[PDB]
């Protein structure tokens, strides 16, 4: 298994696929995104590789995106899929049963808080109940067949909220909140708790790293990243977390840094090939030669 990036943006937003590999340190090159997107989210169903919303900033213009295209390793090929209901700049996502949800993001200046789920046997999106608040950049992670929805920007305000949604009652619960305002963090679930990486708070770009625990309801900061970073990509592999890219305010990162949770530590372990913020990063078996 590889960790695949898609999309991002320097300068302009990006259409590579490159699939890294821990053991040996390779990049490998893969099959272009259809169309270059940035602030799209990244997920795997089944062994395939979902690339969600996102925005297209070219220099011949800018539209956000509801596309959603499926990458088969066995393959290398791009397939489109049947599309969101809206485009979602700086969206999450998270699988749950097989199923994919897009949560928030921004098209234009509408600050979405409405969700959708898709279905893969069926190719087909259906809206769900939205969000208590409309959140773009917002963090998503599933734990227990619930999904969570963390942080992110209201338009006006950033937000330490997260809020808990339950498929089989279709509504949205408030949880215990953030220890810090984050926009364009990275969440993910290791183990059996979400962390919440990085991110953006209106002032600075964050280093610090936080994770809740759903048995107590609360959130503690462990052991922050080397490197400030808002727009980061994030996954897990094999036990530890990655987390690729992101913005500093100053730089386009390259960095990818990995989480032991048993040591409490970071390391930077590679640099993609080009530096980048806002890709969708997700996790799958190798390609085929």
Not at 95 to 114: E, F, K, Q, T
Not at 157 to 168: F, I
Not at 187 to 204: E, K, R
Not at 247 to 265: I, K, N, Q, R
Request: aromatic share 10%.
């Amino acid at each position: 298994r590889l960790i695949y990036t898609a999309g991002g943006y320097f300068r302009q937003s990006l259409s590579y696929l490159e699939a890294y590999n821990p053991s040996d340190g390779t990049w490998l090159r893969l099959a272009d995104l259809q169309v270059p997107r940035s602030g799209l989210a990244g997920c795997v169903v089944g062994g395939l590789l979902y690339a969600v919303g996102g925005r297209n900033n070219s220099p011949d213009g800018n539209t956000d995106s509801s596309a959603l295209d499926c990458y088969n390793p066995m393959t290398n090929q791009w397939s489109p899929c049947a599309p969101m209901s809206v485009p979602r700049n700086r969206i999450g996502v998270g699988v749950i049963d097989g199923h994919i949800y897009a949560v928030g993001g921004s098209h234009g200046c509408i600050h979405h808080n409405s969700v959708e789920r898709y279905e893969p046997e069926r190719d087909e999106w259906h809206l769900v109940a939205p969000m208590l608040t409309r959140r773009i950049g917002v963090g998503v992670a599933v734990l227990n067949r619930l999904l969570y929805a963390v942080g992110g920007f209201d338009g006006t305000n950033r937000l330490n909220s997260a809020e808990c949604y339950y498929p089989e009652r279709n509504e949205w619960r408030m949880i215990t909140a953030m220890n810090t305002i984050r926009s364009g963090a990275g969440v993910c679930v290791l183990h059996n708790c979400i962390y919440a990486a990085g991110g953006y708070d209106g002032q600075d770009q964050l280093n610090s790293v936080e994770r809740y625990d759903v048995a107590t309801a609360t959130w503690t900061f462990v052991a922050p990243m080397k490197h400030r970073r808002s727009a980061l990509g994030i996954t897990v592999h094999q036990g530890r977390i990655y987390v690729l890219g992101g913005y500093d305010g100053h730089t386009f990162l390259d960095s990818v840094e990995c989480y032991d949770p048993d040591t409490d530590t970071w390391s930077e372990v590679t640099r993609m090939t080009s530096g980048r913020s806002g890709v969708g990063v997700a996790v799958t078996m190798e390609p085929s030669r």
